[PDB]
Each structure stands twice: as structure tokens, then as C-alpha cells.
Amino acid sequence: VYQEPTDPKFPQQWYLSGVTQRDLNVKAAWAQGYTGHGIVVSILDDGIEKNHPDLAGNYDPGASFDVNDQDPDPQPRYTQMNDNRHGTRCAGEVAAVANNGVCGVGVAYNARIGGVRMLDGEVTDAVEARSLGLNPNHIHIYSASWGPEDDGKTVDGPARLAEEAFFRGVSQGRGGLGSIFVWASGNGGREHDSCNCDGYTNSIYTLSISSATQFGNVPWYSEACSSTLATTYSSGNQNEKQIVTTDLRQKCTESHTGTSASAPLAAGIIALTLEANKNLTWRDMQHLVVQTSKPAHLNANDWATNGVGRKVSHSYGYGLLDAGAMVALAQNWTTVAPQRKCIIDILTEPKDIGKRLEVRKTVTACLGEPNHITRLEHAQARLTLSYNRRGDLAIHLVSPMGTRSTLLAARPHDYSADGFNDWAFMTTHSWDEDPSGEWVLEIENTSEANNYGTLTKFTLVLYGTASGSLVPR
């Protein structure tokens, strides 16, 4: 009989388990025997307090480095305002030690945990690449609770070295199975930011994780977009509980918050899942997340059923992670087929946007060719366009099965006249659909202003396979 942790703050970890069903179903995974043993997670952040009484027992120097100061020791820099507490808080969510009379427990409280000190300084492309590419045959899972500015006017993503690190990680990392990159989808909710304007979350190589409050609502800081894959609990209003974790100076906190707290919980659940089947590829893991995540009782006004019967929201992706269901489905999972890529250049001539532009195109999805896709995974609309005020644009993409993805919602603060330069807007919402047939791109001016511009390129990029479907939900 599984005995749940006795740690003093475990009863306050409302998101891990409970009779109420408002949790991530993590105790059910623990009871199946999965606690993270043998899995290695690295927190890419401002450092990790490696001697913290709730981290020391799980700490892994092989999962750690200090990129800011070019040394192996990721110890945080101590300051009066405890500025560098952030990475230690994230690490405790993943792998805080259980049953040791200290604070609470990690989701994967027997996993090995490290940290890359890379935020305490100028975060260049090279700094990101050296962190994302750290010891990729030892680290299984990378957790990143940082990214481009959430001011609601930035469009930015990995530069060349960082993108090269993503492709090297998913291709050769973890023995060729692929590094698992977990990303926090963003804190830009108050600025009406879109997490599709963030190339890290929008990447197909990352599992972008959004947040839900204790009462099942969309937090004030949440960013909606089509690239988000799933959700974990985090903070909300001041009547809702928050996240319990290790804090700087060997302390315990019950007030960890924001998008930053969601990705580490996902990384922990993925660690449990990898223990249940160490042969899962980076794409396997995203399939498991899609199939097992739970919409129920998450409140949103945009829940839609896609072409294969799955509910999906721009606030939540496929819903809340379910650790028990993840580890159960992992055990007998059949590795997916190799990833195919079908490139469809849509336009025959540039198109003026004006007040509204609709581009319709019927595709065969590389019928007759070795990259024929009948089972979609990610889809991208790679758009090049000019426009006088970028944030007045709203962009939607409709799949042949009728699933409408919001690629871009209005961003009131985005006054940019720089448009989009082959920006690869990504949607997870048509996962497992057949992409053959009519795709529709809609670009509209959401303001009364007389805006102007031109769409000069629209590449539809389909990823997926031609085998192995399930009966739709």
C-alpha cells in the first residue's frame, strides 16, 4: 500500500492530490510506483541552491552548469532582495525530497535535479544555446520558465545557435530519442500578449504549458495562443492557493506564482512518464500529453471540439495534465512513426490585406510521396506580410476538419510597422486530424483605422505521419 509523503507542507500541495479532483492526479502515479527514479531534469534559470535541505539529496552536478560565470557551480548569487530565488523555487516543484521533514515534495521526488545558471546576466543567443545543449546524453528533460518580454508588442524567438540547439537536442539528444524541452507559455495576460509571438513556446520542439487557477479559471497573467499544448495549476487571485516549493536561503515558500510555476510541474509529470517508459521519443511525449490531458471543469469561453473529438482551448491547450493517466498510457506505448514534413507554398501572387483577407487552398498533403501525411501533429502557417500597425491584426487558420485555430489575436500595444518576416505561427489544435482538403487563412483588421499591407508569402508546413490512428474521441 502506497504511503503518501509525510512532509510538513505536503497537505498544502493542493495541486498534487486530493478528494476534490481539482489536482494533477500525481498521487495516482506515485501509487503505480513512479516517483522519478533514474530521470534527470535541469532547470534553466538563475541558478539552483544545490545545498538546499530539500534539494541536496536529489541534486545532480551532471545536470548543472553556470553559463553566466563559465563554471560548473550553479549556486545563485545572493542579494538583499533575493532576486535569484526563481530557479530554486522551480527546482523544488520538480524534485524536492520527500519524507524528510522539510517543506513539501517534488512531483518527481526521486528524480535527479540540476540547474543551469544562465539568466543572471545578459541572455545572448550563445548563452541560450549552451544551456539548451548542456550534457544532452545525461539530462532527459529541460525546464525553462523564461522567455522574450511579455510587453504584448514583441515578436521574438530563438536565434540561430538556440534553434540549432533545439534541433540537435530533439535529433541526437537522449540517445537519439530527443531532449524534452518544457516551456512556460508566458506572463503577458495583462498586456493581451499572444504566446504565438514567442518563438520558444511556438516551437514544435517545446511542450508549451499554460496555467489554471485553483478554482479552474484563466489566471490574470495567462497568454492565449494556438501553440500551447497543455496546462498545470498555478496561482490566481488572493483567495486561491499558490505553489509550495523550496525557496532561497534554505527556506520553504507557499507563494510561488505565475507562468513560472506551471512548466516545472509539467516537467515533473513528464519525468514520471519517462520512468514508466524510458524509450519514449520527444514526439511520443507530446502524443501522450494530447491523449491524456483533461479539459473538465477548466473554465474558458473558447472550448472547441477538433476533428478527432478532442476538446481544445487557446487558454489551456488540451487541458490539465493527468500524471496517473500519463504513466499508465506510457507503459505499453508504441513508438510513433518517423516524422514527415509536407511543405505547401500557398500563394501564386501577393495579396493586399485591407480590412479582411481570406486565402483558401485545397491541399493533398504530399499524396503519393514519402512525406504524405494523413495524421497531423503540428501545423505551421509561415507568413510574410507587411502592415502599418501589427497589433490590429487577427489571424485564424481553419483545418479541413473545421478546426479554427487563432494564430494571432489583437495585441493593443503592438504598434509595430515591421509586420511578420516568415513567422511560423503554430497550432496544436488539429493534432491527429487528416490535413488533406481545404485550409482557410483569415487575416483581418480588428480596428476601425484605415490600415494597409500585403501578404507576400504563406507556407503551410504540415508535420506528422501516415499510420497509427485511434478511433476519434
Added chain:
Amino acid sequence: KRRVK
């Protein structure tokens, strides 16, 4: 900043 917590 180029990147933020």
C-alpha cells in the same frame, strides 16, 4: 532585457 523570468 532580451529575456525575462
